[PDB]
């Protein structure tokens, strides 16, 4: 029925209209300063005027860093382009790393557009070259009340004749894109053959010409890849071009200049609009100093939207360096341009509260004494261990045909499962690397 | 109508020098660094001098001191029509393009060439369109009267023009622009446009371009889309030689003239020794642009070597280049720059709050206050007041911790996080 993995318990940050973080709201406990800072980011990005600022989360394991990322993503909404990312995947084997960085930065920028398409439909009565002739064909579409003839381009007619359409075939044809598609045969010819694989469909209703506005959203990266290389086509030259190069290539600076100029013209027209995005990169400490020194310039850009980072280390050596040991594995030059949100760990009461909340969303019922147990051993080992053991305890209750997780259930669960500490301890007494 | 937002360099528009290379203390958003701004004027006179080439200048200094701001202000001072290139040292490091030819292309893109071409344009409102032809034999003879404020002339149009006029649908009242050589048609408005003057207007069309584009075009018939997509690489040097000779003879006969561009390279301390030697040898080129170095790193070991060269660069590069540095900022410089931030991003910060932000910027860092002034906007408007007070600044300071504060916090919380070995304690008991 329901699916979850350490998350989906977040329905929002859980603030008020005044910006004060409620103690328990949106399935959140503690981190009041962190939640208020996240709301500061919320009304930073709602202003959509700021650009080029970096905010990272400083916290250890189980500190709710990526949980806070899920919270901010949830409160951002579908319209706001949020792009989660992992600091390890930025390493690319086919293209340079900085190209991937700029690619995801351009992905972060989204922009709503409005457009109207022209729709033609009906049954074609003639497929004949005009006449002393050239590769053009007149086509006459017959709808329920639409009756028009159309002369078409050689390429679109080539796509038409590759669609194997004929007289008595109702088709769906667009004017702007030019994509061809046959709906089928008219029901008037259903009786003509007693049996036929081809299915008969009614004549299109209404008039052949149609109009409608489209408010579809598109990121600037999608436009850049659209005008960088062709995307689709029903004519042979389209596949020729696509198969000429399937390799992804970098983007020139002048290409970015022209795409931002054209989108500036479109937004000046009064139709286009722009909305910044949020970039979340997991374990930014995992990437190399090369990306750091490229971001030293990338942060100083103009259209570069707000980026959120996270780390799980302290006074550690920077990747690609020997003597450059820095906090969070981030060199000082970038941290001068970085702002930090401090996080805090969780003690017994809030650990118990989060476990019982995620058990409620887990649709598992835990008795009070078993709640006390999971509060107990969820502290001297980790909260994550009790979080994992929640489901096996419920299933062990189910096997005993009981709907309540009891102290005995968690007892056998912890007896037949060992944590990292127990694994290390039993590794201490090893005959042959046990 | 450029699309610009608030940025760490969007405030400055021009260096703000004098005729005698005298920098005004507060000019065009650029403040302080009198010697640096005088050197900026010197490199200006270099770049619009045009008679010198192959000059390398080094700009160094402490972090966050605005050397990148100095370069951005210089670029703004150059203005339009001057080919300027700004890039860091990480973009060159690529696998499809080796470092050497990438740097060659970086040099090549810098210098631009002006091309002046005269065009014949026919622009006037149409009266009617009448095309003679055959029903099945062709024999197309198109005619259409073209009118303006001072002529009413009938024109017999050839096959190409009326084929185009059949391609794009136009009506009698529509106005179109006709060029004789190309034969293309451009219509913009309907009786919207009020054409005037002579039909046979003889106006030139001037196109600027760097020699990189012509090099890529001549390298390959696919060079058009190659430069439009960047998937070029390893152009034969004989093409470079022939194109250099061709533009040379063009210069002597004067049909096209070159515009020596400006190259900006950042983070040269992370540059490789092979690239250093390539720069050392390519500086002697006659077509060598004026390039400045932006090294934010001091004494460090040059990449590819185990030797800790000063300024992170080998002395061979430093010998054939001049070096200027930048200094710190006294508290009044911080005051001025934060005032420029407040006016640029529209912050009505309180005077006492302004002083508190000035102090916090002075002791900690400039960019910390530069972001605090931005966050103070929403910290104030959340209580619905346009002005920003001292309590908002203190709230921003306590909410968003500082780098030194985080360093201290982790120094007594080493066990909270992982170490160099990676060990970390997660249990809260024993």
């Amino acid at each position: 029925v329901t699916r979850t993995a350490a998350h989906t318990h977040i329905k929002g940050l859980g603030l008020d209209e005044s910006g004060v973080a409620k103690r328990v709201e949106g399935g959140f406990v503690g981190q009041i300063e962190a939640r208020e800072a996240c709301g500061v980011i919320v009304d930073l990005i709602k202003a959509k005027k700021m650009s080029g600022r970096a905010i990272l989360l400083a916290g250890g394991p189980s500190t709710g860093k990526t949980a806070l990322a899920l919270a901010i993503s949830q409160e951002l909404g579908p319209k706001v382009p949020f792009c989660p990312l992992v600091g390890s995947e930025l390493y690319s084997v086919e293209v340079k790393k900085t190209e991937t960085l700029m690619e995801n930065f351009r992905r972060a920028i989204g922009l709503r557009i409005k457009e109207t398409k022209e729709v033609y439909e009906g049954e074609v009565t003639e497929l004949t070259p005009e006449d002393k002739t050239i590769s053009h064909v007149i086509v006459g579409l017959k709808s329920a009340k639409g009756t028009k003839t159309l002369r078409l381009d050689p390429t679109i007619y080539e796509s038409i004749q590759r669609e194997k359409v004929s007289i008595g075939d109702v088709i769906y044809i667009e004017a702007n894109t030019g994509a061809v598609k046959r709906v089928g045969r008219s029901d008037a010819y259903a009786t003509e053959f007693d049996l036929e694989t081809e299915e008969y469909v009614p004549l299109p209703k209404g008039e052949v010409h149609k109009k409608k506005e489209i408010v579809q959203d598109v990121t600037l990266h999608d436009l850049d890849v659209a005008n960088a290389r062709p995307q689709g086509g029903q004519d042979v030259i389209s596949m020729m071009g696509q198969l000429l190069k399937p390799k992804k290539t970098e983007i020139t600076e002048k290409l970015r200049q022209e795409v931002n100029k054209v989108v500036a013209k479109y937004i000046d027209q009064g139709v286009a609009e722009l909305i910044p995005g949020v970039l979340f990169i997991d374990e930014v400490n995992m990437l190399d100093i090369e990306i750091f020194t490229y971001l030293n310039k990338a942060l100083e850009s103009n259209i570069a939207p707000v980026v959120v980072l996270a780390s799980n280390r302290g006074m550690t050596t920077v990747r690609g360096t020997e003597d450059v040991i820095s906090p969070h594995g981030v060199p000082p030059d970038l941290i001068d341009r970085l702002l930090i949100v401090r996080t805090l760990p969780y003690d017994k009461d809030e650990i118990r509260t989060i476990i019982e909340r995620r058990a409620t969303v887990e649709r598992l019922q835990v008795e009070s004494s078993a709640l006390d147990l999971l509060a107990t051993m969820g502290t001297e080992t980790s909260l994550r261990y009790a979080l994992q053991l929640l489901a096996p305890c419920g299933i062990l209750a189910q096997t005993s045909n009981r709907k309540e997780i009891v102290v005995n259930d968690v007892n056998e669960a912890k007896l037949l499962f060992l944590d990292a500490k127990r694994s290390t301890k039993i590794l201490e007494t090893s005959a042959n690397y046990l | 109508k450029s699309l610009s937002l608030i940025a760490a360099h969007s405030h400055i528009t021009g260096l703000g020098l004098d005729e005698n290379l005298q920098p005004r203390p507060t000019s065009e958003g650029m403040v302080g660094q009198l010697q640096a701004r005088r050197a900026a004027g010197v490199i200006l006179k270099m770049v619009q001098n045009g008679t010198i080439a192959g000059r390398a200048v080094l700009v160094a200094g402490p972090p966050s001191t605005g050397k990148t701001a100095l370069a951005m202000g210089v670029s703004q001072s150059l203005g339009k029509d001057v080919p300027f290139t700004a890039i860091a040292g990480s973009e060159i490091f690529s696998l499809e393009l080796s470092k050497t030819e990438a740097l060659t292309q970086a040099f090549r893109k810098s210098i631009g060439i002006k091309i002046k071409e005269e065009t014949e344009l026919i622009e006037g409102e149409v009266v009617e369109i009448q095309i003679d032809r055959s029903i099945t034999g062709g024999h197309k003879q198109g005619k259409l009267t073209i009118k303006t404020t001072d002529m009413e002339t009938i024109y017999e149009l050839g096959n190409k023009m009326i084929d185009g006029l059949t391609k794009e649908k136009v009506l009698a009242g529509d106005v179109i622009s006709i060029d004789k050589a190309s034969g293309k048609i451009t219509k913009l408005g309907r009786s919207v446009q009020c054409p005037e003057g002579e039909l046979q207007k003889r106006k030139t069309v001037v196109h600027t371009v760097s020699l990189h584009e012509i090099d890529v075009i001549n390298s390959r018939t696919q060079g058009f889309l190659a430069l439009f997509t960047g998937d070029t690489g390893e152009i034969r040097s004989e093409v470079r030689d022939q194109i250099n000779t061709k533009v040379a003879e063009w210069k002597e006969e004067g049909k096209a003239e070159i515009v020596p561009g400006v190259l900006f390279i950042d983070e040269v301390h992370m540059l490789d020794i092979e690239c250093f030697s390539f720069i050392n040898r390519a500086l002697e080129d006659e077509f060598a642009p004026i390039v400045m170095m932006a090294t934010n790193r001091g004494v460090s070991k040059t990449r590819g070597t185990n030797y800790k060269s000063p300024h992170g660069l080998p002395l061979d590069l430093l010998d054939r280049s001049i070096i200027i540095t930048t200094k710190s900022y006294n508290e009044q410089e911080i005051k001025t720059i934060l005032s420029i931030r407040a006016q640029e991003e529209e912050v009505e910060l309180s005077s006492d709050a302004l002083d508190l932000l000035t102090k916090t910027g002075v002791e900690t860092s400039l960019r910390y206050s530069s972001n605090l002034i931005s966050v103070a906007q929403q910290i104030a408007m959340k209580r619905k007041n346009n002005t920003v007070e001292v309590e908002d600044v203190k709230r921003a300071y306590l909410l968003f911790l500082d780098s030194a504060r985080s360093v201290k916090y982790v120094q007594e919380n080493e066990s909270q996080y992982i170490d160099d070995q990676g060990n970390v304690q997660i249990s809260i008991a024993k």
Partner: peptide, 22 residues
């Protein structure tokens, strides 16, 4: 640019004709 699909009649329209007046 040129519209891929254009209005075409049978009685008044003809491929050779192209007349536009006031």
């Amino acid at each position: 640019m040129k519209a891929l699909v254009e209005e075409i009649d049978k009685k008044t329209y003809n491929p050779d004709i192209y007349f536009t007046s006031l």
